[PDB]
Design a protein around this ligand. Structure first.
Ligand SMILES: CCCn1nnc(NC(=O)c2ccco2)n1
Length: 165
């Protein structure tokens, strides 16, 4: 199962890890992708997860969008986890760099409650432009299921742990 995580709360754990390497090692039931509404996995966590699937995640995602149209900011869809997990839960956190409502971050984390255990990144962090300290606080105050957070950046991981209330 998951190893080397620091316990933050009853149900939230955190580790300085590359979520792709973590997914290949654990092969969890659910890996969360930091998706956009179009499921265009170009960069950040999405670009890295997609590259690890040899673009199979993008091919599956384009078929999903062709059939269903875009997701909502704050929404999600369950697709295959390919070689990384049983399932990938593509969750759209607000992208502050695109002027999206930061208040939708709680709605985005509510998607995690439909899964008993997940390997996940901090939503809206990184290239999505939100403050990761705020993302972690919304995560702990919203998610009730078991969430194993992988934070790629060591310096950010240390700041998140040392400032956690
Ligand atoms: C790229 C280094 C790790 N990192 N990942 N997301 C962030 N972002 C921030 O620290 C930030 C954005 C708005 C306020 O603070 N840093």
């Amino acid at each position: 199962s998951f190893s080397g995580y620091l316990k933050l709360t009853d149900n939230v754990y955190i580790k300085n890890a590359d979520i792709v390497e973590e997914a290949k090692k654990v092969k969890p039931t659910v890996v969360v992708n930091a998706a956009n509404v179009y499921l265009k996995h170009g960069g950040g966590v999405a670009g890295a997860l997609n590259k690890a699937t040899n673009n199979a995640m993008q091919v599956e995602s384009d078929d999903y969008i062709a059939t269903n149209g875009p997701l909502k900011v704050g929404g999600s869809c369950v697709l295959s986890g390919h070689n990384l997990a049983k399932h990938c839960l593509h969750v759209v956190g607000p992208n502050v760099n695109k002027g999206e409502d930061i208040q939708l971050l709680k709605s985005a984390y509510e998607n995690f409650n439909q899964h008993e255990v997940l390997l996940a990144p901090l939503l809206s962090a990184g290239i999505f432009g939100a403050d990761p300290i705020h993302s972690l606080r919304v995560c702990v105050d919203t998610v009730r299921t078991n969430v194993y957070l992988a934070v790629f950046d060591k310096n950010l991981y240390d700041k998140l742990v040392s400032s956690f209330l």
